[PDB]
Amino acid sequence: MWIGVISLFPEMFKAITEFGVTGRAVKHNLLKVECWNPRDFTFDKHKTVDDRPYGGGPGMLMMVQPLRDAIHTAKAAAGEGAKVIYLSPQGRKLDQGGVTELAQNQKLILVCGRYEGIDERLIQTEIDEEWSIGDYVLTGGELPAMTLIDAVARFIPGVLSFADGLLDCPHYTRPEVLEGLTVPPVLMSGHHEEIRKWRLKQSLQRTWLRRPELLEGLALTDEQRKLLKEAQAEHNS
Numbered sequence: 631m632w633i634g635v636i637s638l639f640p641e642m643f644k645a646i647t648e649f650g651v652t653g654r655a656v657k658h659n660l661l662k663v664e665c666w667n668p669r670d671f672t673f674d675k676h677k678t679v680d681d682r683p684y685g686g687g688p689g690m691l692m693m694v695q696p697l698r699d700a701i702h703t704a705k706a707a708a709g710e711g712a713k714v715i716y717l718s719p720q721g722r723k724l725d726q727g728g729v730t731e732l733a734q735n736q737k738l739i740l741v742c743g744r745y746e747g748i749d750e751r752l753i754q755t756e757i758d759e760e761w762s763i764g765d766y767v768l769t770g771g772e773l774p775a776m777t778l779i780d781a782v783a784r785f786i787p788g789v790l791s792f793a794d795g796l797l798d799c800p801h802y803t804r805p806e807v808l809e810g811l812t813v814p815p816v817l818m819s820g821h822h823e824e825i826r827k828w829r830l831k832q833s834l835q836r837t838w839l840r841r842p843e844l845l846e847g848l849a850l851t852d853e854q855r856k857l858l859k860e861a862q863a864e865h866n867s
């Protein structure tokens with residue numbers, strides 16, 4: 631997968647390109663991240679990348695000309711078939727369904743805003759889709775871009791409970807007893823099918839207790855329905 635990035639702070643992307651599973655994906659050429667910086671497309675002495683909003687108020691916007699030229703250059707490098715994404719709080723809120731959809735693209739270009747964002751007409755003329763990572767306010771689009779890249783990278787062949795839309799079950803490792811708390815005996819049992827069912831029941835229980843709205847979005851199998859009923863009965867005992 632190839633991801634173009636437009637950012638005033640390309641070095642921030644080292645966080646995903648030099649570390650962990652995404653870092654491995656980049657080193658092994660499974661994932662390519664290529665950055666263009668609007669600062670390199672300025673022509674004035676002081677390499678100005680911001681500009682004043684019409685109508686005044688506080689805050690600056692990204693300057694149109696350097697940003698537009700960086701986008702054009704990215705598009706030219708991507709060739710045909712690249713979807714241009716602007717990350718913003720007015721975008722579609724990212725969720726796992728969204729990620730799986732985004733992961734179908736072989737090529738993406740991600741535009742990272744700073745200051746109060748970008749001129750609305752650039753969204754109209756250059757941007758295909760707008761996406762948010764959540765209903766909170768951040769200082770720039772770079773962390774959101776990295777969040778998206780990380781999420782989609784998991785779908786790239788060779789890189790590696792929300793799979794079934796449920797919260798994860800609890801996990802245990804050594805030691806057997808930790809501050810008086812013991813590992814559930816079923817996990818020490820060796821009984822593969824009992825363990826599978828325990829994990830599924832736990833996942834259903836936690837989704838019900840913590841995020842019951844997520845259960846309304848699922849069509850549970852007969853086994854899931856049984857396990858949920860048993861977990862609800864136990865909770866009510």
Ligand SMILES: O=c1[nH]cnc2scc(-c3ccccc3)c12
Pocket residue numbers: 717718719742743744745746747761762763764765766767768769770771774
């Ligand atoms: O502030 C946010 N919250 C949630 N998602 C996102 S994606 C991009 C941004 C962003 C932040 C600052 C300026 C321009 C864009 C954002």
